[PDB]
Amino acid sequence: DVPSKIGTLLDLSATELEQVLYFSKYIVLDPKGAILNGVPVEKRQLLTDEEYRELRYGKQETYPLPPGVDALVKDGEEVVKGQELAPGVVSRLDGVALYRFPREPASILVVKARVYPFEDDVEVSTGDRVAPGDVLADGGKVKSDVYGRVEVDLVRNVVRVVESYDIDARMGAEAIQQLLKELDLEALEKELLEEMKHPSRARRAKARKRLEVVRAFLDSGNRPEWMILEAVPVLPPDLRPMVQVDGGRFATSDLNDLYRRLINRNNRLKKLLAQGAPEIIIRNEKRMLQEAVD
Amino acid sequence: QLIHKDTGLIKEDEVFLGHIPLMTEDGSFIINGADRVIVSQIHRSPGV
Amino acid sequence: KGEDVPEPSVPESFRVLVKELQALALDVQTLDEKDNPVDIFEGLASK
Amino acid sequence: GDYLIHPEHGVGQYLGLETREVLGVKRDYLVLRYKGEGKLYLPVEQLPLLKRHLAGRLLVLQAKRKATPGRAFPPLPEWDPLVEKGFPYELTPDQKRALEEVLRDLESPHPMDRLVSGDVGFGKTEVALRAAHRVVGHGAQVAFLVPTTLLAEQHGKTFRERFQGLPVRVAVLSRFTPPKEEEAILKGLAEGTVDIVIGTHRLLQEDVRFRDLGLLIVDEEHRFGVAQKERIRELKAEVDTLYLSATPIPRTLYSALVGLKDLSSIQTPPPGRKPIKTFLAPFDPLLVREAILFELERGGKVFYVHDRVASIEARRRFLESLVPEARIGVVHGQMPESLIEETMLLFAEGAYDVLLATTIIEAGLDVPEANTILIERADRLGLATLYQLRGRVGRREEEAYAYLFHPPRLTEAAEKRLAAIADLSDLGSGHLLAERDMEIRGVGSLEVYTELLEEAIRK
DNA sequence: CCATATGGTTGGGCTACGGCGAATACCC
DNA sequence: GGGTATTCGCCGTAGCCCAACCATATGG
Ligand SMILES: Nc1ncnc2c1ncn2[C@@H]1O[C@H](COP(=O)(O)OP(=O)(O)OP(O)(O)=S)[C@@H](O)[C@H]1O
Fold first, then answer.
1. Burial code of D375-410, b = ≥16 C-beta within 10 A, e = fewer?
2. Where does the Helicase ATP-binding domain start and stop, copy by copy (chain D) (predicted)?
3. In terms of CA atoms, which chain C residue is nearest residue A240?
4. Other CB atoms closer than 10 Å to residue D434's CB: what's the count?
């Protein structure tokens, strides 16, 4: 129903909740001090899965080269964007590089990673994420100076770290419910009053409507999270009477068919999560689940 | 006459195209035993 | 039986409407005049 | 007025010559009447392109041989340790029980008529191996009418893997079998110097003469044939019958088959097994890319099926355009045996990586390294075929991944069919109850059977 | 004399308008 | 940026298909 009351509270548009409720883009919970291509990120933020991966795992580019030919870059070497990394292949991004097959490499990756050579022990393990200014290795001498996940290298005695953020964003009604758990209505009402003190009559009217809705949420005594369903009720069966007509057919309420399709898809996705399926069919099945309950 | 222009193949046949309801003598129609009729329909003439 | 037909208590339409509304994930609070939550089903099909 | 024969359209009746019309083109025609006024006006340039000129009989036969003993079987309890040595593996005690059960059905003068079932991949061969060894232990021949000539070739490979220390003369007769070898095998078992035969129903249609009609072991009668079931009955005059058809007929015979076929299923057929981690989806090529990446990670093999409604090599080139890494090969039918066995030995070589079949009859092989199976055309499949694809991949110490794709997501028969497929957990009797439900749908009579049971004792 | 093209066999399975409104346009 | 239409714009008004197998003919 227009205006969407969930979108009225959580300050969105119908397209954005369409996205996050049919798994088109992420939405954040904590920015965790991340960034988006130069501008830092904020709460209630759209995010493509491309950007989600890029801020989580990042952009790594691997390049081919002539077979049996030694490259200008050596193993574990800093690369500048625009460098002639190869005999003939120009760089693209900024990070450290690794070979594939010497004799004199065959292919070379470069990654968004800082490197810090360790001499003594490492204080962390591989996969551990850590902010700048925090210790990493050599009893605290080698330390984290970028946001990223650490990879130790006992071979070259280098604690490297692939520079990435630990921002939590999700795609789902669980995430919408998560945001709905975190609404102080009081300062919300107060800043709505501040927009009432603003001149601009359009934003004044929008804030007026949002204020009336949130005052209704105040007085009615409700968690807005109760707009999200987690256990759907099941009607008495006689009110959906699937009965036998004289011709052998069953005069049947369509609610029985609806309940059947919901039970089928629901127990199917329970079984799917029970095994640890690859996530693509998980997203598609949750899409069909929301479609079915709709 | 299914006639290909190029090879000159002329597959000629006498196909069957369903049934057409026939008018009675007095002017009615007999559809499934029911007695039916068609009423004329006036409308605007074409042209300018 | 040959007497006056009595008067029904909770309405049949009332009851099925309450259950249809509770089917829509919507609690409906049937009250008295003093906000005591009155049951209309007498605990028949309610735990 | 001639009985002419068009080389393309067969019968034709000469009518004359026509100088008929085209769109402003003057070519001439000779004219032919066909069946039901087909007046083809053939152009004259095609002048040398024309020439001139019931069951109750079998039912009471079945009830007769049911009432008839036929022959008895001695045990010979010394020969079977020798060949029993020849398989270095342990035997399931359920399987050993069913083995001794069907062998005591053999040793009775009644005809041995049983069916051992169970969830596949357990050596259903081995009971048939030692039963056939006892049968050739008394000199009696062993036949095997097979579902697939590929399975015939694999079964002959396993039999020769067992018959090393035995002087057993085995053979395979099929369409794929070369004709000199075909009639040489027909000769060799016609006088019986060939002992054990496998093959498809050229064995049943070329009227071969047999020498010992003792033991008949047939598998997978579900796709054999109904009138070819009657052909099996023609073959089965006074015989002892074993069926390794875990996948039965949809209760159009399997209703009455219970009772007189002592159902001898085994449970937990193999130990050390893995639940088949199936999935299901609609079609997506990137998922195929990730799946073939998974199987090249584990270094395994891949089956891939199709509908065969068109060519499959064009689809194969399309998948190779998707994945230019692996080496994909088609085992399409209607090819000579040279092509099929070259593909089989190249996947034994395994430089070829993806077996692109179109049929379970094209792909009923217990290839060990296969652990990934993908299906596009799961909508147009019978359930028995579907789980036969499922169990047909499967090896010890290894998981399995199945990706069955729904194009419409809508066909309600196949919707509930794939639902009652996807209810699976792992091995053990779930196929049996699934077949039970499918057979409920299969019927969906005892009265005439009570009549024929009565008269069969009188006959 | 041997090796395919195509035939036919059975089986297996299958489907245009009132009309309030509203982003927007026009105005001062 | 507040005020004034506005204009469309949707809301309400019981049949095959395809697979394998065997057979005959037919070309090197
Ligand atoms: N005694 C045994 N116990 C367990 N597994 C065995 C035994 N003997 C053989 N096997 C395995 O069983 C498999 C036989 O191949 P399958 O054909 O898949 O099994 P099958 O049951 O004989 O045939 P099906 O059921 O028609 S697929 C092989 O992988 C053998 O290693």
1. bbebbebebbbbbbbbbbbbbeeeebbbbbbbeeee
2. 105-266
3. C20
4. 18
Q: How far apart are CA D100 and CA D102, in angstroms?
A: 6
> So what's the architecture of A111-164 in CATH?
Beta Barrel (2.40)
Q: Compute the distance from residue D339 Cα to the ligand 1 centre, in Å.
A: 27
Q: How far apart are CA A96 and CA A160, in angstroms?
A: 9
Strand, helix or coil for residue A148: strand
Cβ atoms of D185 and D197 closer than 8 Å: yes
Who contacts A160 (Cβ-Cβ below 8 Å, separation ≥6)? A76, A96, A113, A114, A115, A116, A150, A151, A152, A153
Contacts of A48 (CB under 8 A, 6+ apart): A25, A26
d(CA A111, CA A117): 17
D61 by DSSP, 3-state: which? Answer: helix
Long-range pairs for D85-90: beta carbons < 8 A, 24 or more residues apart: D86/D162, D86/D164, D86/D165, D87/D126, D87/D129, D87/D162, D89/D123
Contacts 24+ apart (CB under 8 A), D128-132: D128/D217, D128/D242, D128/D244, D129/D83, D129/D87, D129/D159, D129/D162, D130/D80, D130/D83, D130/D84, D130/D99, D130/D103, D131/D99, D131/D102, D131/D103, D131/D106, D131/D215, D131/D217, D131/D242, D132/D196, D132/D215, D132/D217
This structure's resolution (angstroms)?
Answer: 4.1
Q: Provide the sign of the torsion angle of the four alpha carbons A217, A220, A223, A224, taken in this order.
A: negative
The one-character DSSP state at D139 is T
Sign of CA dihedral D235, D236, D239, D243: positive
Tell me if C32 sits within 8 A of C44, measured CB to CB. no
- Which positions ≥6 away from D153 have C-beta within 8 Å? D172, D176, D341, D344
Give the residues surrounding ligand 1 with Cβ less than 6 Å away.
Answer: D 89-92, 120-126, 270, 366, 391
How far is D429 from D213, CA to CA, in rounded Å? 33
Spatial CA neighbour of D398 closest among D251, D290, D299: D299
A3 upstream amide cis, omega within 30 of 0: yes
Q: How many CB atoms lie within 10 A of CB D249?
A: 20
Cβ D38–B10 below 8 Å, yes or no? no
Strands (E), D188-319: 196-199, 215-218, 240-243, 262-263, 277-281, 301-304
The C-alpha atoms of residue D345 and residue D354 are separated, in whole angstroms, by 13
Compute the distance between CA of residue D46 and CA of residue D42 in angstroms, rounded to an integer. Answer: 7
Whose CA is closest to atom 2 on ligand 1? D91
Strands of D35-169 (E only): list them.
38-43, 113-115, 142-145
**Nearest residue for F20, CA–C1':** D361
Q: Which other chains touch chain C, taking contact as 3+ CB pairs less than 8 Å apart? A: A
